[PDB]
Amino acid sequence: PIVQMIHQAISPRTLNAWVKVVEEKAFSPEVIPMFSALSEGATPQDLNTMLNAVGGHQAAMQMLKETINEEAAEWDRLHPVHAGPIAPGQMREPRGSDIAGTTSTLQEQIGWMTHNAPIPVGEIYKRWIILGLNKIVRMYSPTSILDIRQGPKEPFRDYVDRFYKTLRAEQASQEVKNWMTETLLVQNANPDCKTILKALGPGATLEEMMTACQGV
């Protein structure tokens, strides 16, 4: 990565941490924040390093490759290369593959990131990667939000844990997720807690809901 802006090689414990995360957590939602944290200020070479280090899950890594290629293609369509030689004191405009790090040197990436009025190639590539990771997380989620229902003997807190876990994996905008929270959560609770929740009303917070069904 580059830290203020000075280039640093990716540390062994950062890379190991990411590898271990992929092994232990598969493609759980929390891996995406983790990834970002382990790739803070990272060059495209660092990001490719993290992805390539993963052994196994090669179907998911291939899907990630196809997503990255789609994003690179869209970038190329939006940003067409301009003919003519590069002038001194200037650098060539980055193609999609340069952002992915496959066709650009480390010095070129450093140059784009450090130069005044910069192009943050690492952050763009990072966005593409996180997009594909979201695709993978959503496909690999077994459960659907509609199916989560509270058991008759199940404590409300556990039910809310399951519900919001599944919700975190769901493919939906924040408006849709809001609708799910304010529609399905109370509807799918068990009858005792469901009645008690209905009694609270439409504006009840999560804290009030969990406190109300705490005894239940």
- Scan residues 121-150 and list those touching a copy of itself (CB under 8 A): 135, 139
184 within 8 A of 195, measured Cβ to Cβ: no
Smallest separation (angstroms) from a copy of itself to the CB of 4: 5
Q: Is 25 left (phi over 0), alpha (psi -120 to 50) or beta?
A: alpha
**Is residue 34 a contact point for Cl ion (CB under 5 A)?**
no
Q: Which residue has the tokens 């919001």?
A: 164
Whether residue 162 is annotated as binding a ligand: the answer is: no
160 near a copy of itself (CB under 8 A): yes
Is the CB of 29 or the CB of 94 nearer to a copy of itself?
29
d(CA 62, CA 47): 15
Residue 182 binds a copy of itself, judged by CB under 8 A: no
3-state secondary structure (DSSP) of residue 94 = coil
153 binds Cl ion (CB under 5 A): no
Q: Which does 36 bind (CB under 5 to 8 A by kind): Cl ion, a copy of itself, none?
A: a copy of itself
For a copy of itself, the closer of residues 80 and 186 by Cβ is 186
Instruction: Give just the sign of the alpha carbon dihedral 41, 68, 105, 119.
Output: negative
118 in contact with Cl ion (CB under 5 A): no
* Contact call for residue 171 and a copy of itself (CB under 8 A): no
Q: Which residue, 59 or 81, is less far from a copy of itself as judged by CB? A: 59
Which residue, among 42, 46, 22, has the nearest Cα to 34 in the 3D structure?
22
Beta carbons of 122 and 36 less than 8 angstroms apart:
no
* Residues tagged in the binding site annotation for ATP: 13
